[PDB]
């Protein structure tokens, strides 16, 4: 009997392979859609990052203050900051914290020269070399006082 049984088994197989081949077509389609999403997303972030970076450089020139990093604990929200301009010495870095919200100003000096330190020390009030605290209200005011003291 089994030449018949054999032709039948070929039928069954041909059909099994057909389902497989459609499933493959489907998966390849998904792979193509995701392959697209990836490439688009990759550009959209690189473009968003270049845009945000020029706007950052605008701010740094407009305001004479660079905000390169940010140091967030659960305690507060910190930023690394540099203010002033290059040539005496005219630039002052510090960290700002936000913590009933209050601002903590903390000086950063350890990467300086004693000469740079002397010029700063004379151009700036004594208390800009002490960790301070004060309300958000005074923040703008704070900014202006360092800006004046530098040029």
């Amino acid at each position: 009997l089994l030449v018949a049984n054999l032709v039948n088994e070929n039928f069954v197989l041909s059909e099994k392979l057909d389902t497989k081949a459609t499933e493959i077509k489907q998966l390849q389609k998904q792979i193509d859609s995701l392959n697209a999403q990836v490439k688009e997303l990759k550009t959209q972030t690189s473009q968003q990052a270049e845009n945000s970076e020029v706007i950052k450089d605008l701010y740094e020139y407009l305001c004479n203050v660079r905000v390169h990093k940010s140091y967030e604990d659960d305690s507060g929200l910190w930023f690394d900051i540099s203010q002033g301009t290059h040539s005496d010495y005219s630039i002052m870095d510090y960290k700002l914290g936000f913590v009933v919200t209050e601002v903590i100003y903390a000086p950063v000096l350890k990467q300086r020269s004693t000469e740079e330190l002397y010029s700063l020390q004379s151009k700036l009030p004594e208390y800009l070399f002490e960790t301070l605290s004060f309300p958000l209200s005074s923040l703008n005011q704070f900014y202006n006082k360092i800006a004046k003291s530098l040029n």
Binding site: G76, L77, F98, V99, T101, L136
Partner: protein
């Protein structure tokens, strides 16, 4: 979930102010500003 620094108020104006109402040409403006150095007197 908690912001120590309050959120910006200047951003609101982005919807309110029509910055896109005018777009102009940098080099043209930068020409118009010197007006004209080429005259009967040149």
């Amino acid at each position: 979930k908690k912001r120590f620094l309050p959120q910006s108020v200047l951003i609101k104006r982005e919807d309110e102010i029509a910055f896109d109402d005018f777009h102009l040409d940098a080099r043209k403006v930068l020409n118009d500003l010197s007006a004209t150095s080429e005259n009967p007197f040149s």
